[PDB]
C-alpha cells in the first residue's frame, strides 16, 4: 500500500487511478492514452539499421520458403525460459532485443508437449535427436502427448483415423492463451511477483477448511509455478543485459519489457497460436510521453516499433509434417488487436495504431504479426481510409467487429487470440479445440456410421438410409442424432486433452500475467459448414440419387436440378447454415466439461479445409471426393457468384451468438471491382466493411473479414516465379502467410478460391 | 475367458473355485492350503550354499553397521523397474534371484520423490551426484518434494521447524502400500495385464458420460500406468533369464515370481515401509504339491525360503541423516504376516509358517523381514510355543491380534503394513501420515501457542494459562482447543502430500497388483501419548506448579505429591490416555480429506519418540526437556513398575476402535522373569499373550506386541563390544533393528527403557 521511488519515477507525468494501487492495465490505458484522429502524414520511414537488419533476416526467410524446412533447430537442448544465451541479428543495430534461441530463426525443442513430435521433426528434416533428450522425455518426464494417448478411447482413435475428428491439440501446444505482456512494462517484475504471492496466500483459508480441496491445491501449485516463472523472466532479460525488476521508465523500455514477457512465453510454450494481445495503444502512452519531453524523435519511435515488430516476424516453432498440413504457411498467430472504440465513446486509435500498420511499408508486407483492426462504424475516417489503403497495398490485414464484441463483453480491453477468438486481456483464455468435420458427419448419417472411404464402422452402427432419392427430413433427422454423437466424442476428447495439458504442460509464464481466476471456455470448431449446408440444399431443392456400392454404401451422388448455394444471399440455403451453427452449439452446450470450461463454437478451419476435404468422399452438394472444403465459413470454392454484397450478407448472417469463439471469412476482391483509382478504392473498401460490420438491435452483423485485394493472375505468376515475390503476403483462413511458404497443393486450394469480380 | 494350456499345466492338482475365473488370491488359498497343527520337528537345517551366501552378505552388513553408512550407491542412474542389469551375490548358488541394483547392498537413486534428499545423501556419504541427474530433476521433471513445498503454508512450515508436526512424508516415499505380489505367481503377468485392460475399458462409459469426470480421467491414466508397469516387470525378470508371462509351475517359480513382483516395487519406489504381505501360507500350496510329488525334499524347500528371506534381508534405500533420526536402524519394514485363523475356523498356520520362523535359525537373528505373528487364542498350541521359543531365542518377532482384526475386517486375507497398520491384500492401502507431537500440543495449550524452546508463536495466538498451580479442567479445555488446531494443520499437510505423491510419484508397479478400486485411509499418528497422559494425571491428582520466565512462558514444572502413571493398570491415569486417543480421533474424523481417504489413527512413533523428545521442553509429568518420549503407545521409560500383566493390561485398554491404524507396544522381559527353565518360559510367554490378546464382545484386547526377551546387562556389553554381536536383533517400536545399526543416542533410548523384572 505504498508506491516506492521506483514506481513514482517511472510513472512521472502519468494520470493517477486505481491502476497505481493494483494490477489494472485497462485503467492505466483509459487514463493516459491520447485518442488520435489525424492522418498518416506524420509517419516516418525506416532507418538504415532497420533495413539492414530486416534484409539479413529475409535471407533466412527465403531459405525457409524454398526448402519448406527450418533454417536450423536444436537437437540436444530442452527449451525453457532461461536455457538459451542471448542471440542477436546484429547487437550493434537492434533497439529491441531477444530471440528464442541463440540465433535468428533457429527453432527450439519444447519437449513437455511430447517427444514423438520432436522425433518426427528430426526425421522429416534429416537431423538426429540427442539420446538423452529422448530418454528423459520418454521415461522420466511424462509429456502431454503420452498422457492424452494413455486415456483416449478406441472410438476417438477411430474418428481421428477416419477424418471426422482429426488434428486436435494432442500433439502440439494448445495455445489460445494471451498473457498480458503489458503488465511487465507497467509494473515491472517485482510488483507482479508480490501480487502473485498475495494471490497464493488468498487460497490458504479454503485449503485448510476443505473447500473444493483438489481445485484449491491445483490452483495454489499453479500460482506457485507462475511466481517462479516471473523470477525466470528476470534471469532471461538479464542474459541480454537488462534488469526488469522495476517498471519501464521510457518508450524503449516499455516496448522492450512487454516483448520480454512475450519472449518468455515463446521460449517455454509452443502453442499453436501465441498471440501478442492489444498493445499498440498501450505502448503509445510511453511513446507520446517521450515525444512531448523531446526524448525521442518520431523516426526513433517508428524504429523502436519496427524492431519490435521485426522480432514478432521471427518467432518460429519446430512442427511436424502433419502439423504442416493442418496449419499451413509456417503460422505463428502473433496477433495484435489495433484500434477499436472505448466504452466511453472515444476512439482507442492512436498514432501508434498507425506506426504498426506502417511496418508493412517500412519492412514490406509480412504475415506476422497478425495485425487485426478492431473495426467500428465510428472510427476516425482518416484511420478507416488508411487501413483500407494498407489492405489494397499489402493484403496483410484482417478486420473484426468492435461494434459487436465490445458491447458483448462490455469491455474495451479484449484482444483476438489466433484468428477470431476474443478474450478480455489477463482475465480470459480458451481451451483450444481445433475443429470437427461436419460434412463427413452428414455422410455417416446416410451410411449408418460406416466410413465411405475406409468402409469402417466409426459412428454408431445404424441402418443406412435406403432409397433412390434423398429426402430432406429423413437425412436431417439422422444428421441430428449423429451430431449428438459427434458432440459427445468431441467434448470427451477435449476433456482429456486439457486435463493432460494442465498437468503436463501448464503455461506458467503466460498464466503469471493473468488474474488469479481465469475464465475458460471450451472452443469447439466446425469444418465444412458450406459443404454440409449446400449438401442439404441440393437434397431439399433438387433431386439427389445415391450411387451405392455392392454393400449398399453411398459412395457418390447424382444431382437432378439446380439448388441454392451458400454465399449468394439466398435465404433458402443460408437458413440451413444458420441452423446448423445453432444445432451443434446447443448440443455441446449440455455436456459436462473439464474445469467447467464453458462450451463455445467457432466456424474456423485453418488448413483443415484441405485435410478434411482430402479424407471426405463425394458429397450431396456435388463436391468431388478429396476436394478441399471452403476456408472457415466461406461459401464453397467459386459458388458465391453474385458479387461482394451478396456473399458478405450470407456470411454476416451466421450467428455470433452461437459461435462466440469466432466466424472466419476470407474475402478476395480484384482491384478494379473496388474502383478506378485508389481514392475510390479506399473509400469503397471502407464502405463495404461499414455495411458488413453494421450492427444494431435487429442486426448482429459480421464478426470477421480477411481482405485480399489482388488479381488471380498475379498468384499464377508467383507460382511460376517464386523468387519474384519474396514477401508477397495473403490472407488464407483468418491469418496470413507468405505465398511462397505454402506447398504446391495448398497454393492450388488458394488459386481456386473465389475472386469477387463485382460489388 | 478360456484357460489355455499354460494355466492348465501350471494349476495341475489344484482345486477349482472362482479364483480360476477372476483374480482372487484369497479364494485360491482357501481352496488349496493345507492347515498344519504339528510341531517344528520336521524343520531342516541350512544348506552350505545358503550359509556361504549369507556369510558373504553379512560382510557388507558389518561394514554398514560400523560406518553407519551405505556400502555403496548410484550417483548417476535414475532407478526404474528396468534400469539396472541382473545382479547376484553368487549366480551359481542362488535358488531365488534378484537385486535392486547390479550389486549386493548397493543403494539406488529414486529421484521422482525429490532431488534435494539425494544431494543431501551424497554430501553426507561423500559421493558426488551426477550433474545431469540433478538438472533433470530440478528443471525438467518436477518431484514430489518440490510439489509439496510449493503448496505448503507458513503455518505448516512453523510446525515442522518447532517439532509439533515433523517428519511427515514430504521428503521420502510414503509407502504403506502392499501390492499383492502373490498375483504374479498365481496368474502370471499376461493374465494380469489382460485384467487391467478390462479395468481400463470399464471406465470408458463414465468418461464419455461426464460422470466424476476428473476422477475417471485420473483413474484411467493410473490404470494405463499400472498396465505399462506390468510389462516392465516382464522385461526386468527376463534380464535374469525368466519368463513370467504365464503362472508359476512349481514351488521355486511361485517364490521367484512373487519376489519378482516385490522387486519391481523396491526398484521403483522408496517408500518408508515396503512390506511383503501375507505370503508364507500362500507359498505352502506350491511347496506342498512339490513335496507330495517328490520333486523337492524338505531341506530343499527350506533353502528356497531361506534364499527368498535372504533377499528381503538385503533390501536397501538411500536415506539422509535426517531420515535416519526419524527412522533408526536402517529399517525397511519388509513385513510378512504369518499364521492367523481363517473365517471358517481352520488355522491358517502351515508348515511354511514354521519354515519362515526357521530362517532365524538357519541364517541367525535378523530385523528384516519383520515377521509378524497373527495371533489367536485358538492357534495350534504347537505353533504358539514354537513362536514363543523363537522370541526367547531371538527377540526378532512381533505379535498382532488376529482375534481382533479378522473379525473387524470380516476377512482372513489382510496383511500388516509397516508395524501395525492392517489392510486387506490388494484391496486397501493407507495414505501414510507419520505422527504428530501430542505432548507439545499440551505445552502450547499452557503457553498460549508459544513454543517453549524457540519462544516464537506457532499455535494460534492465545492467552497463556495463569496461576501458581495448574488445574486439570482448565488445562484440558485449552488442550482440547489446540488439538482442534493440530488436527486441521495435520490433515491439511497430509491432503497436500498425498495429492502430490499421486501426481509425482504414483506407485504404479504396486497399484498394478491391486483391484481397480482401492480403499484408502488417511493415517494420523500420535507421539507422546504416555507423556501427555501422565502430565494430565499429575495435574489432576497432584499439585503441578509452573515455573515461568520473565515473559510468562512455562519453562519448567515442579510437582508436589505422587500421581498414577500409565502402565500400572490404574484406571485413574489409563482413562486419561483412553480419553486422548478418543478425542483426537473424533476431531480428524470431521475433516475433508484428499480422495476421500477415511481418517484413521495410530499410536505409533518409530523413532519420532527421540526426535520429538529432543525438541520438547520440560513437561507436567516430570519428563525433562530433551528426553525421549516412550516408543509408540509405551509407558514412559521405567514408569511401569507393577509387572508385565499390569502394563499389558494398561496398553490393551487403549481403543483400537479409535485407533484403527494400530497401537504399538514394545514389551521387554528378562529371561528369568518368564521362567526357571526353557519349557516354562515358552508356556508362560504364550500365556501372557493369550491374556493380552484375549477378545470378546466386552473386551477388545491389545492389538500388537513387540517381544524382547533379554537382560539389560547384555545390551551394555554389546555397546562396548559391537563386534561380538554382529547379528544381535532387538524390537524397538513395531519393527526390529540390529542393535549395532543404531546411533549411540538411539541406543541410550533403548537401554534406559523398561526391562520388566516380573509378571
Ligand atoms: O519448417 C518449415 C515448415 O514445414 C513449412 O510449412 C514452412 O512454410
Ligand atoms: O516408464 C514409465 C513412466 O512413468 C512413463 O509412463 C512416463 O515417463
Ligand atoms: O545408510 C546407513 C544409515 O545411515 C544407518 O543409519 C544404517 O544403520
Ligand atoms: O523450472 C520450472 C519447472 O516447472 C519446475 O518448477 C519443475 O521442474
Ligand atoms: Na528480400
Ligand atoms: Na520454463
Ligand atoms: Na484438482
Ligand atoms: Na452474425
Ligand atoms: Na514414477
Ligand atoms: Na500368564
Ligand atoms: Na483395546
A325 C-beta closer than 6 A to ligand 1: no
Please give the number of the atom of ligand 3 that sits closest to the Cα of B737. Answer: 8
Those residues with Cβ within 8 angstroms of residue A610's Cβ, 6 or more apart along the chain or in another chain: A325, A328, A628, A629, A745, A746, A749
- ∠ CA B562-B745-B556, nearest 5°, is 35
Grid look-up 506457532 returns: B458
A468 C-beta closer than 6 A to ligand 2: no
Distance separating alpha carbons of residues B95 and B618, to the nearest angstrom: 55
Closest C-alpha among A408, A334, A396 to residue A365? A396
Distance separating alpha carbons of residues A33 and A29, to the nearest angstrom: 5
**Alpha helices, DSSP H only, in A512-570?**
529-540
Cross-chain Cβ contact A208/B153 below 8 Å: yes
What residues of chain B lie within 8 A of the CB of A593, using their CB? 210, 213
Q: Tell me if A445 sits within 8 A of A478, measured CB to CB.
A: yes
- H helices, E strands: number in chain B: 28, 18
| SS3 of residue A32 by DSSP | helix
What residues of chain A lie within 8 A of the CB of B150, using their CB? 220-221, 224-225
Nearest CA to ligand 2 atom 3: A139
Chain A 88-117, residues with CB within 8 Å of chain B CB atoms: 111
B741 C-beta closer than 6 A to ligand 3: yes
Read off the C-alpha cell for A420: 477470431
CA–centroid distance, A363 to ligand 11, in Å, is 85
Would you mind telling me the total number of residues written for chain B in this entry? 759
Cβ atoms within 10 A of the Cβ of B717, count? 12
B737, B742, B747, B750: CA torsion to nearest 10: -20
B331 C-beta closer than 6 A to ligand 3: no
Cross-strand pairs, B423: B415
Chain A touched by B221 (CB under 8 Å): yes
Residue in B153, B232, B460 to test binding to A, most A beta-carbons within 10 Å: B153
Cross-strand pairs, A525: A435, A602
What residues of chain B lie within 8 A of the CB of A592, using their CB? 210, 213
Q: Tell me if B287 sits within 8 A of B352, measured CB to CB.
A: yes
Chain B touched by A214 (CB under 8 Å): yes
Distance separating alpha carbons of residues A37 and A34, to the nearest angstrom: 10
Residue A7: domain span: 1-759
What residues of chain B lie within 8 A of the CB of A150, using their CB? 220-221, 224-225
Ion ligand 10: protein residues whose beta carbon lies under 5 Å:
B 687-688
How many distinct structural domains can be found in chain B? 1
Q: Tell me if B25 sits within 8 A of B426, measured CB to CB.
A: yes
A180 C-beta closer than 6 A to ligand 1: no
Chain A touched by B220 (CB under 8 Å): yes
Read off the C-alpha cell for A271: 502453442
Q: Which of B80, B217, B492 sits opposite A207 (nearest CB)?
A: B492
Those residues with Cβ within 8 angstroms of residue B127's Cβ, 6 or more apart along the chain or in another chain: B73, B75
Distance separating alpha carbons of residues A24 and A491, to the nearest angstrom: 34
Distance separating alpha carbons of residues A561 and A544, to the nearest angstrom: 9
Distance separating alpha carbons of residues B290 and B303, to the nearest angstrom: 14
Cβ atoms within 10 A of the Cβ of A678, count? 15
Q: Tell me if A664 sits within 8 A of A706, measured CB to CB.
A: yes
Grid look-up 458427419 returns: A441
Distance separating alpha carbons of residues B414 and B423, to the nearest angstrom: 5
Task: Return the exposure string of B69-97: e unless at least 16 CB atoms fall within 10 Å of the residue's CB, then b.
Answer: bbbbbbbebbbbbbbbeebbbeeeebbbb
Grid look-up 505399462 returns: B228
In A9-157, beta strands by DSSP E: 72-78, 106-109
Ion ligand 5: protein residues whose beta carbon lies under 5 Å:
A 58, 726
The catalytic residues of B are: 418-419
Using left for φ > 0, alpha for ψ between -120 and 50, and beta otherwise, residue B638 falls in left
- Ligand number nearest CA of A56 is 5
- ∠ CA A427-A429-A433, nearest 5°, is 170
CATH of the domain at A99: 3.20.70.20
Q: How many CA atoms lie within 13 A of A60 on its CB side?
A: 18
Distance separating alpha carbons of residues B254 and B283, to the nearest angstrom: 7
Q: How many CA atoms lie within 13 A of A547 on its CB side?
A: 10
Cross-strand pairs, A524: A601
Which chain B residue's Cα is nearest to A140? B141
Distance separating alpha carbons of residues A491 and B217, to the nearest angstrom: 13
Chain B touched by A492 (CB under 8 Å): yes
Cross-chain Cβ contact B495/A217 below 8 Å: yes
Write out the DSSP string of A401-422: EHHHHHHHHT-S-EEEETTTEE
What residues of chain A lie within 8 A of the CB of B492, using their CB? 207-208
Chain B touched by A591 (CB under 8 Å): yes
Grid look-up 554381536 returns: B725
Choose which residue among A140, A142, A228 to substitute to test ligand 4 binding: the one with the highest number of ligand atoms within 8 A of its C-beta: A228
Distance separating alpha carbons of residues A336 and A359, to the nearest angstrom: 13
- Ligand number nearest CA of A81 is 6
CA–centroid distance, A675 to ligand 4, in Å, is 58
A:B CB pairs within 8 Å: 89
β-pairing, B106-109 vs A335-339, is unpaired
Q: Which of A136, A140, A592 sits opposite B213 (nearest CB)?
A: A592
Chain A touched by B499 (CB under 8 Å): yes
What resolution in Å is listed for this PDB structure?
2.3
Using left for φ > 0, alpha for ψ between -120 and 50, and beta otherwise, residue A369 falls in beta
A473 C-beta closer than 6 A to ligand 2: no
Those residues with Cβ within 8 angstroms of residue A653's Cβ, 6 or more apart along the chain or in another chain: A574, A577, A578
Q: How far is CA B116 from CA A24, B138, B432, in A?
A: 39, 9, 21
Amino acid at each position: 500500500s505504498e508506491l516506492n521511488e521506483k514506481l513514482a519515477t517511472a510513472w512521472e507525468g502519468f494520470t493517477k487511478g486505481d491502476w497505481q494501487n493494483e494490477v489494472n492495465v485497462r485503467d492505466f490505458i483509459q487514463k493516459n492514452y491520447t485518442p488520435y484522429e489525424g492522418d498518416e502524414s506524420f509517419l516516418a520511414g525506416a532507418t538504415e539499421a532497420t533495413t539492414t537488419l530486416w534484409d539479413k533476416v529475409m535471407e533466412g526467410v527465403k531459405l525457409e520458403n524454398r526448402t519448406h524446412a527450418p533454417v536450423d533447430f536444436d537437437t540436444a537442448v530442452a527449451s525453457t525460459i532461461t536455457s538459451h544465451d542471448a542471440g542477436y541479428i546484429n547487437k550493434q543495430l537492434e533497439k529491441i532485443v531477444g530471440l528464442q534461441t541463440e540465433a535468428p530463426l533457429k527453432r527450439a525443442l519444447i519437449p513437455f508437449g511430447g517427444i514423438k513430435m520432436i522425433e518426427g521433426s528430426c526425421k522429416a528434416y534429416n537431423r538426429e535427436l540427442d539420446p538423452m533428450i529422448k530418454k528423459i522425455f520418454t521415461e522420466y518426464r511424462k509429456t502431454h502427448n503420452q498422457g492424452v494417448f494413455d486415456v483416449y478411447t478406441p472410438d476417438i482413435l477411430r474418428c481421428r483415423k477416419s477424418g471426422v475428428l482429426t488434428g486436435l491439440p494432442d500433439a502440439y501446444g494448445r495455445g489460445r492463451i494471451i498473457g498480458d505482456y503489458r503488465r511487465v512494462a507497467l509494473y515491472g517484475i517485482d510488483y507482479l511477483m508480490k501480487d502473485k504471492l498475495a494471490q497464493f496466500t488468498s487460497l490458504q483459508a479454503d485449503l485448510e477448511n476443505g473447500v473444493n480441496l483438489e481445485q484449491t491445491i491445483r490452483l495454489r501449485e499453479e500460482i506457485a509455478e507462475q511466481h517462479r516463472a516471473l523470477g525466470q523472466m528476470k534471469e532471461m532479460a538479464a542474459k541480454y543485459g537488462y534488469d526488469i525488476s522495476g517498471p519501464a521508465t521510457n518508450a524503449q523500455e516499455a516496448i522492450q519489457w512487454t516483448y520480454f514477457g512475450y519472449l518468455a512465453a515463446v521460449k517455454s510454450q509452443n502453442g499453436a497460436a501465441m498471440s501478442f494481445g492489444r498493445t499498440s495503444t498501450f505502448l503509445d502512452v510511453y511513446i507520446e510521453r517521450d515525444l512531448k519531453a523531446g526524448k525521442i524523435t518520431e523516426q526513433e519511435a517508428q524504429e523502436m516499433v519496427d524492431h519490435l515488430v521485426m522480432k514478432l516476424r521471427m518467432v518460429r516453432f519446430l512442427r511436424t509434417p502433419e502439423y504442416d498440413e493442418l496449419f499451413s504457411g509456417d503460422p505463428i498467430w502473433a496477433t495484435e488487436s489495433i484500434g477499436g472504440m472505448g466504452l466511453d465513446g472515444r476512439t482507442l486509435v492512436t498514432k501508434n495504431s498507425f506506426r504498426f500498420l506502417n511496418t508493412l511499408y517500412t519492412m514490406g508486407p509480412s504475415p506476422e504479426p497478425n495485425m487485426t483492426i478492431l473495426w467500428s462504424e465510428k472510427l476516425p475516417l482518416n484511420f478507416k481510409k488508411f487501413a483500407a489503403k494498407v489492405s489494397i497495398d499489402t493484403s496483410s490485414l484482417q478486420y473484426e467487429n468492435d461494434d459487436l464484441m465490445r458491447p458483448d463483453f462490455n469491455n474495451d480491453d479484449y484482444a483476438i487470440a489466433c484468428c477470431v477468438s476474443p478474450m478480455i486481456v489477463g482475465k480470459q483464455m480458451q481451451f483450444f479445440g481445433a475443429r470437427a468435420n461436419l460434412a463427413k458427419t452428414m455422410l455417416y448419417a446416410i451410411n449408418g456410421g460406416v466410413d465411405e472411404k475406409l468402409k469402417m464402422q466409426v459412428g454408431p452402427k445404424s441402418e443406412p438410409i435406403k432409397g433412390d432419392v434423398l429426402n430432406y427430413d429423413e437425412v436431417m433427422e439422422r444428421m441430428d442424432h449423429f451430431m449428438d454423437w459427434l458432440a459427445k466424442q468431441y467434448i470427451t476428447a477435449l476433456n482429456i486433452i486439457h486435463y493432460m495439458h494442465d498437468k503436463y504442460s501448464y503455461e506458467a509464464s503466460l498464466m503469471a500475467l493473468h488474474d488469479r481466476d481465469v475464465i475458460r471456455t471450451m472452443a469447439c470448431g466446425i469444418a465444412g459448414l458450406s459443404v454440409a449446408a449446400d449438401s442439404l440444399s441440393a437434397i431439399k431443392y433438387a433431386k439427389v440419387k445415391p450411387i451405392r456400392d455392392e454393400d449398399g454404401l453411398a459412395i457418390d451422388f447424382e444431382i437432378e436440378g439446380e439448388y441454392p448455394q451458400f454465399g449468394n444471399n439466398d435465404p433458402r440455403v443460408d437458413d440451413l447454415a444458420v441452423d446448423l451453427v445453432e444445432r451443434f452449439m446447443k448440443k455441446i452446450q449440455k455436456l459436462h466439461t473439464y474445469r467447467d470450461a464453458i462450451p463455445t463454437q467457432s466456424v474456423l478451419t485453418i488448413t483443415s479445409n484441405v485435410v478434411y476435404g482430402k479424407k471426405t468422399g463425394n458429397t450431396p452438394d456435388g463436391r468431388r471426393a478429396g476436394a478441399p472444403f471452403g476456408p472457415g465459413a466461406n461459401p464453397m470454392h467459386g459458388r458465391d457468384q453474385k458479387g461482394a454484397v451478396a456473399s458478405l450478407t450470407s456470411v454476416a448472417k451466421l450467428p455470433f451468438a452461437y459461435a462466440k469463439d469466432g466466424i472466419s471469412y476470407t474475402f478476395s476482391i480484384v482491384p478494379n471491382a473496388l474502383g478506378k483509382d485508389d481514392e475510390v478504392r479506399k473509400t469503397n473498401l471502407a464502405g463495404l466493411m461499414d455495411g458488413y460490420f453494421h450492427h444494431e438491435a435487429s442486426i448482429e452483423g459480421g464478426q470477421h473479414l480477411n481482405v485480399n485485394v489482388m488479381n488471380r493472375e498475379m498468384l499464377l505468376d508467383a507460382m511460376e516465379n517464386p523468387e519474384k515475390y519474396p514477401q508477397l503476403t495473403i490472407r488464407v483462413s483468418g491469418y496470413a502467410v507468405r505465398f511462397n511458404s505454402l506447398t504446391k497443393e495448398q497454393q492450388q486450394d488458394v488459386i481456386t478460391r473465389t475472386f469477387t469480380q463485382s460489388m
